[PDB]
Design a protein around this motif. Structure first.
Motif, PDB file in Angstrom:
ATOM      1  N   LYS A  14       0.675  -1.359   0.091  1.00  0.00           N
ATOM      2  CA  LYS A  14      -0.345  -0.061   0.067  1.00  0.00           C
ATOM      3  C   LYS A  14       0.414   1.049  -0.080  1.00  0.00           C
ATOM      4  N   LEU A  15       1.889   1.079   0.591  1.00  0.00           N
ATOM      5  CA  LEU A  15       3.127   2.094   0.460  1.00  0.00           C
ATOM      6  C   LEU A  15       3.114   2.191  -1.037  1.00  0.00           C
ATOM      7  N   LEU A  16       4.094   1.586  -1.447  1.00  0.00           N
ATOM      8  CA  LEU A  16       4.247   1.655  -2.904  1.00  0.00           C
ATOM      9  C   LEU A  16       3.303   2.133  -3.792  1.00  0.00           C
ATOM     10  N   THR A  17       1.991   1.594  -3.831  1.00  0.00           N
ATOM     11  CA  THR A  17       0.967   2.130  -4.266  1.00  0.00           C
ATOM     12  C   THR A  17       0.473   3.447  -4.515  1.00  0.00           C
ATOM     13  N   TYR A  18       1.036   3.685  -3.202  1.00  0.00           N
ATOM     14  CA  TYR A  18       0.461   4.980  -2.504  1.00  0.00           C
ATOM     15  C   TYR A  18       1.393   6.364  -3.215  1.00  0.00           C
ATOM     16  N   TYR A  19       2.574   6.172  -3.894  1.00  0.00           N
ATOM     17  CA  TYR A  19       3.900   6.585  -4.020  1.00  0.00           C
ATOM     18  C   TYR A  19       3.660   6.968  -5.266  1.00  0.00           C
ATOM     19  N   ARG A  20       3.156   5.756  -6.057  1.00  0.00           N
ATOM     20  CA  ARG A  20       2.819   6.063  -7.448  1.00  0.00           C
ATOM     21  C   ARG A  20       1.341   6.541  -7.681  1.00  0.00           C
ATOM     22  N   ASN A  21       0.645   6.762  -7.607  1.00  0.00           N
ATOM     23  CA  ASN A  21      -0.551   7.063  -7.476  1.00  0.00           C
ATOM     24  C   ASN A  21      -0.909   8.416  -6.635  1.00  0.00           C
ATOM     25  N   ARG A  22      -0.226   8.773  -5.738  1.00  0.00           N
ATOM     26  CA  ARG A  22      -0.711   9.905  -4.897  1.00  0.00           C
ATOM     27  C   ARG A  22       0.449  11.288  -5.311  1.00  0.00           C
ATOM     28  N   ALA A  23       2.094  10.771  -4.408  1.00  0.00           N
ATOM     29  CA  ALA A  23       2.672  10.542  -4.264  1.00  0.00           C
ATOM     30  C   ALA A  23       3.904  11.645  -5.100  1.00  0.00           C
ATOM     31  N   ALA A  24       3.796  10.474  -6.243  1.00  0.00           N
ATOM     32  CA  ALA A  24       4.445  11.027  -7.384  1.00  0.00           C
ATOM     33  C   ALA A  24       3.750  11.796  -8.517  1.00  0.00           C
ATOM     34  N   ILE A  25       4.952  13.046  -9.242  1.00  0.00           N
ATOM     35  CA  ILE A  25       4.182  13.817  -9.981  1.00  0.00           C
ATOM     36  C   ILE A  25       4.284  14.243 -10.939  1.00  0.00           C
ATOM     37  N   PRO A  26       3.403  13.939 -12.020  1.00  0.00           N
ATOM     38  CA  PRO A  26       3.134  13.359 -13.404  1.00  0.00           C
ATOM     39  C   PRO A  26       4.360  13.687 -14.564  1.00  0.00           C
ATOM     40  N   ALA A  27       5.112  13.543 -15.130  1.00  0.00           N
ATOM     41  CA  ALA A  27       5.390  13.693 -16.182  1.00  0.00           C
ATOM     42  C   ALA A  27       5.716  15.197 -16.156  1.00  0.00           C
ATOM     43  N   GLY A  28       5.368  15.437 -17.359  1.00  0.00           N
ATOM     44  CA  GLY A  28       4.414  16.120 -18.328  1.00  0.00           C
ATOM     45  C   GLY A  28       4.561  17.474 -17.639  1.00  0.00           C
ATOM     46  N   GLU A  29       3.739  17.306 -16.456  1.00  0.00           N
ATOM     47  CA  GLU A  29       3.600  18.389 -15.335  1.00  0.00           C
ATOM     48  C   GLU A  29       4.558  19.256 -15.085  1.00  0.00           C
ATOM     49  N   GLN A  30       5.247  17.899 -13.703  1.00  0.00           N
ATOM     50  CA  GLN A  30       6.466  18.032 -13.344  1.00  0.00           C
ATOM     51  C   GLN A  30       8.042  19.158 -14.304  1.00  0.00           C
ATOM     52  N   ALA A  31       7.544  19.206 -15.610  1.00  0.00           N
ATOM     53  CA  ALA A  31       8.578  19.336 -17.214  1.00  0.00           C
ATOM     54  C   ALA A  31       8.256  20.972 -17.291  1.00  0.00           C
ATOM     55  N   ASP A 232      23.539   3.343  -0.746  1.00  0.00           N
ATOM     56  CA  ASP A 232      23.241   1.980  -0.111  1.00  0.00           C
ATOM     57  C   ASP A 232      22.052   2.121  -0.676  1.00  0.00           C
ATOM     58  N   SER A 233      22.116   2.421  -1.890  1.00  0.00           N
ATOM     59  CA  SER A 233      20.696   3.066  -2.340  1.00  0.00           C
ATOM     60  C   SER A 233      19.144   2.653  -1.219  1.00  0.00           C
ATOM     61  N   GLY A 234      19.681   3.004  -0.241  1.00  0.00           N
ATOM     62  CA  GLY A 234      18.320   2.822   0.063  1.00  0.00           C
ATOM     63  C   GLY A 234      17.138   3.696  -0.198  1.00  0.00           C
ATOM     64  N   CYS A 235      16.273   3.670   1.069  1.00  0.00           N
ATOM     65  CA  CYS A 235      14.852   4.242   0.489  1.00  0.00           C
ATOM     66  C   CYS A 235      14.355   5.002   1.531  1.00  0.00           C
ATOM     67  N   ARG A 236      14.999   6.047   2.158  1.00  0.00           N
ATOM     68  CA  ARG A 236      15.204   7.269   2.876  1.00  0.00           C
ATOM     69  C   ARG A 236      14.333   8.451   2.008  1.00  0.00           C
ATOM     70  N   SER A 237      14.246   8.810   0.668  1.00  0.00           N
ATOM     71  CA  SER A 237      13.758   9.536   0.607  1.00  0.00           C
ATOM     72  C   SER A 237      12.323   9.363  -0.130  1.00  0.00           C
ATOM     73  N   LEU A 238      12.510   7.665  -0.379  1.00  0.00           N
ATOM     74  CA  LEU A 238      10.987   7.122  -0.728  1.00  0.00           C
ATOM     75  C   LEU A 238       9.841   7.832   0.785  1.00  0.00           C
ATOM     76  N   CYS A 239      10.244   7.773   1.123  1.00  0.00           N
ATOM     77  CA  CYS A 239       9.733   7.529   2.692  1.00  0.00           C
ATOM     78  C   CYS A 239       9.575   8.799   3.971  1.00  0.00           C
ATOM     79  N   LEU A 240      10.416   9.774   3.061  1.00  0.00           N
ATOM     80  CA  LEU A 240      10.091  11.056   3.220  1.00  0.00           C
ATOM     81  C   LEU A 240       9.408  11.427   2.764  1.00  0.00           C
ATOM     82  N   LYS A 241       9.174  11.017   1.286  1.00  0.00           N
ATOM     83  CA  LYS A 241       7.886  11.889   0.153  1.00  0.00           C
ATOM     84  C   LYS A 241       6.771  11.392   0.121  1.00  0.00           C
ATOM     85  N   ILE A 242       6.878   9.568   1.011  1.00  0.00           N
ATOM     86  CA  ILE A 242       5.433   9.559   1.478  1.00  0.00           C
ATOM     87  C   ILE A 242       4.812  10.323   2.183  1.00  0.00           C
ATOM     88  N   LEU A 243       5.696  10.249   3.609  1.00  0.00           N
ATOM     89  CA  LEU A 243       5.137  10.720   4.417  1.00  0.00           C
ATOM     90  C   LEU A 243       4.593  12.720   3.579  1.00  0.00           C
TER      91      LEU A 243
END
Length: 337
Positions: A14-31, A232-243
């Protein structure tokens, strides 16, 4: 193990799903939002060169989460740093804890040698009040000077944007419509660099403290996060972005800031070494627990500047709501999603 392993597997998904469907900004909008920021920045540079070549300012430049790819949900804000030219031997920084007001994380900027270097030695002398360079007065002066030479309607036609200044008290903010029904807010942020001290005109919540400059943290904080993850290719930023996505999506958690959430993660990164992808679910609940711990303690030390309480600007009212919201969701964190 069954019930717990189960809860963790569900939450991860659910965390991974939440990131892609809510946290992640669409490429077009971001560009297009960034392109709009860069367009305005370039145009302001040309403006400053032609109309205000004698103003003691360095060139304005873009900064913020949107520039750092840490912005979430929608591309809606970015800063244009407005860096003042201040001669070393005419100005100095006074830490807020070394002040009667006693406010860590903020600074007084004092005009030095007012006799030997008389008034007029610096343009910015006109913004000195009671011996100190006022963040508020600097901001007002810059707004005046620019507004008295700028032509936003003309720049809008050129870039095909609707560009308008927001009505006060957010007067250093530019409302940029860069596509139908999507807006970018560019806020102009006066900045001072004396020695290795970088300050910004982001007022203390209390007007009684409006003569204090805020110590700039975001860049060093952003850099330590990225370095921790890059190694270490960790998920600190992913976790941050979700929060961040959660707080930005939930009215009752809107009081929390990107900086506050970042330091929660940095403190946890100090406690937990392993941020491999599969630890995300565990680190998320740990971040939520820490949040509650800091809120109940009423203090959240800055990871890079421990004398500074990052919750010092929150009222008892808001602390209460944050704790409440997080205490209502303890049993079932997925609700925050």
């Amino acid at each position: 193990d069954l019930k717990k392993s189960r809860l963790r597997m569900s939450l991860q998904e659910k965390l991974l799903t939440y990131y892609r469907n809510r946290a992640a900004i669409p490429a077009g909008e971001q560009a297009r939002a960034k392109q709009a920021a860069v367009d305005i920045c370039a145009e302001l540079r040309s403006f400053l060169r032609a109309k205000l070549p004698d103003m003691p300012l360095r060139d304005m430049y873009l900064s913020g989460s949107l520039y750092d790819d840490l912005q979430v949900v929608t591309a809606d804000h970015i800063q244009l740093i407005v860096p003042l030219v201040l001669e070393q031997n005419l100005w100095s920084c006074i830490p807020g804890e070394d002040t009667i007001m006693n406010v860590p994380g903020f600074f007084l900027v004092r005009r030095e040698n007012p006799e030997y270097f008389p008034r007029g030695s610096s343009y910015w002398d006109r913004c000195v009040v009671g011996g100190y360079l006022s963040p508020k007065t600097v901001a007002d002066t810059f707004e005046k000077v620019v507004a008295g030479s700028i032509n936003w309607p003309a720049i809008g036609s050129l870039l095909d944007y609707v560009i308008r200044p927001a009505p006060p008290p957010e007067a250093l903010t530019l409302e940029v419509q860069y596509e139908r029904d999507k807006h970018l807010f560019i806020d102009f942020l006066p900045s001072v660099t004396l020695g290795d001290t970088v300050l910004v005109a982001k007022p203390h919540r209390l007007a009684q403290y409006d003569n204090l400059w805020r110590l700039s943290l975001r860049p060093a904080e952003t850099a330590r996060l990225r370095a921790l993850d890059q190694a270490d290719s960790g998920c600190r930023s992913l976790c941050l972005k979700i929060l961040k996505a959660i707080c930005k999506s939930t009215p009752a958690l809107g009081h929390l800031t990107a900086s506050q959430l970042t330091n929660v993660i940095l403190h946890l990164a100090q406690e937990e070494a392993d941020w491999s992808p599969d630890m995300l679910a565990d680190r998320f609940l740990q971040a939520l627990r820490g949040l509650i711990s800091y809120l109940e303690a009423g203090v959240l030390p800055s990871a890079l500047n421990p004398k500074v309480n990052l919750f010092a600007e929150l009222t008892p009212e808001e602390i209460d709501e944050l704790g409440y919201t997080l205490y209502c969701s303890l049993s079932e964190p997925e609700v925050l999603l």
